[model samples]
Target: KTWELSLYELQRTPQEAITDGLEIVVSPRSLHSELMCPICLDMLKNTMTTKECLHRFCADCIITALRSGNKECPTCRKKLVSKRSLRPDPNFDALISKIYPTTRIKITELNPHLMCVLCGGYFIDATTIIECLHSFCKTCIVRYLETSKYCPICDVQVHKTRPLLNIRSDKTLQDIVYKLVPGLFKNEMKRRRDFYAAHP
Candidate 1:
């Protein structure tokens, strides 16, 4: 429940501001919270993810503790069998890198119409209201629904009471956006992963 407020300012700009060899990146505070080590307060440095509950901790935190005879997970309370539970995982780290890039990225184009109407942001996870068949970003619509029951574009009444009941995620639309926009899916997945992690 406790996450950091790193005071990061994020803005999606034009293709003009970029370096030759370096890269540009922006992350939400929540995603930043998840990747940071609970013990060391740094990025997930050689993170160790447990099969039980998938709780993650940096290698320094978990392995050193385990080597010192501790067998229980610090976050999820999963019990690990001594000497056999932890092994070097290649695929997991590979998957992490697939989403959490260590630079070396190629550029791509973004479709103009495939954007969220509410926030005017990238349609990362497109949420459609069954009431109007109108789509917006998932979080953007959810936040708007909390304050108003009407759709933003047409000003149509969503529901008498529960506006969120009419909302649904459109996977194909999201896939369309993903294909059109490079690095969007990968970056969004990292943010989603940050939300889902039970970190130690």
Candidate 2:
């Protein structure tokens, strides 16, 4: 929050100055707290503003709360008429992007890790070739060895006959990948299960 206050003076535009000035004069201090949702205490994602109170909340947060019988403003506690009052605020969204460039960076930072060098996909039945310490998806490695005698990654010699016998299942790496991107991993597992069920 230190940066919030420090950058306040640097941002000459006030939140309310848009009506009076040639440009909207604003600071991080004025908009930072407003940018956050009371429910999540994080920067608003898919922001929604109440047409009645002009109070804002993350669209999903407000919808979930309303669905659970919250009929008042989370910030002001004023009675809300209904979900009809909530509308997406595009102007406020533009302000957030201008003031905070880090939001997109934070999102890009969370993308899932790539496990297989060949396929550039999350590992399925993750296997590591011990001879060269290279890891890959089991199916990818199988297809790779059908045409080559060396590790696809490191060029280490791999025997054509039962080459995978020397390779070890990397459960630990798989667990870490699952934890990092549970949603992606879950979807992958679901797809595999569906495929097997259909084939079997």
Q: Give the per-residue lDDT of model 2 (tens digit) for 24-98.
A: 233444445545788998877777876545566788899988878768887778887775767676544554554
User: Model 2 off-target regions past 4 Å?
Assistant: 1-113, 160-162
Alpha-carbon local distance difference test for all models = 0.56, 0.57
- Give candidates' CA RMSD values in order: 15.4, 23.6
Worst 10 residues of 1 by lDDT: 1-10
Q: For residues 1-200, what per-residue lDDT tens digits would candidate 1 score against the true structure?
A: 11112212122222221123333333434234445566677656676655433455777788777777558877657787665444343333442443353333332222234566667666755776655556677667776788999989878898899887667665544664565355777776666466547342
Instruction: Mark the regions of model 1 whose C-alpha exceeds 4 Å error after superposition.
Output: 1-110, 193-200
Candidate 2 residue pairs that clash: 13-25, 13-26, 14-25, 14-26
Per model, how many backbone clashes are there?
A: 0, 4
Best by TM-score: 1
Candidates' TM-scores? Answer: 0.42, 0.41
